Design a protein around this ligand. Structure first.
Ligand SMILES: *[C@@H]1O[C@H](CO[C@@H]2O[C@@H](C)[C@@H](O)[C@@H](O)[C@@H]2O)[C@@H](O[C@@H]2O[C@H](CO)[C@@H](O)[C@H](O)[C@H]2NC(C)=O)[C@H](O)[C@H]1NC(C)=O
Length: 198
């Protein structure tokens, strides 16, 4: 018969340095070859499972491959892959559904870090924090003396990630750390101290 794709490679992310496994199975097929961003992947990296169904008696080939960060760097950060089922010369090559591969990362250093400040009581306090270049956008959480800053009437979380106190209270004196948690990594800022005087 003709070659049909049993299972399609699924789109996903490359978290950290954890690869993204792409699986692809075809019936009546002898070989499976992947192609990412117009560049064939070495068959040394492909794990091929070849057999025959004990009931149907049809030949199948199940192939997987780990897409690492190195493949993304060598090649738009989002690229496309798809397998190709091969066989006898008369057999026509059938391509599969193309799966796009995204990269999840987080850089080394924050873009805007908080600095220690001595602020007069009743003055509007602002402690900036901009996460490192991350994709997806990392979540910002503030800590004060080891406890998480819970926004209240005085403290408000701004859209730019900066922590803003409308009226600086003496209690607001603490060591503040900004944490940027991402799917790829989690980093914290250098602890800075702020003190309020009257
Ligand atoms: C901001 O922090 C400093 C330092 O705190 C200590 O060291 C940190 C790394 C962490 O381990 C904290 O839990 C420690 O307490 C504070 O200065 C210290 O204050 C403690 C009393 O709370 C005192 O025993 C130490 O001698 C002080 N100095 C040092 C070098 O530790 C400072 O008070 C904090 N500021 C605010 C507003 O909370």
């Amino acid at each position: 018969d003709e070659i049909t794709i049993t299972t399609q490679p699924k789109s996903g992310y490359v978290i950290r340095n954890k690869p993204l496994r792409l699986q692809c199975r075809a019936n009546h097929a002898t070989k499976i070859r992947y192609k990412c961003s117009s560049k064939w992947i070495d068959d040394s990296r492909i794990e091929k499972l070849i057999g025959t169904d004990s009931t149907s008696g049809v030949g199948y080939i199940d192939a997987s491959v780990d897409i690492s960060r190195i493949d993304v760097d060598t090649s738009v950060d989002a690229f496309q892959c798809q397998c190709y089922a091969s066989g006898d010369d008369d057999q026509d090559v059938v391509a599969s559904d193309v799966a796009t591969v995204h990269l999840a990362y987080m850089r080394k250093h924050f873009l805007k870090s908080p600095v220690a400040q001595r602020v007069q009581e009743g003055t509007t306090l602002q402690l900036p924090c901009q996460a490192p270049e991350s994709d997806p956008k990392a979540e910002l959480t503030w800590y004060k003396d080891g406890v998480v800053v819970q926004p209240d009437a005085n403290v408000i979380r701004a859209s730019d990630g900066s922590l803003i106190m409308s009226a600086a209270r003496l209690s607001d004196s603490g060591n503040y750390t900004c944490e940027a948690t991402n799917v790829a990594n989690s980093r914290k800022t250098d602890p800075v101290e702020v003190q309020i005087y009257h």
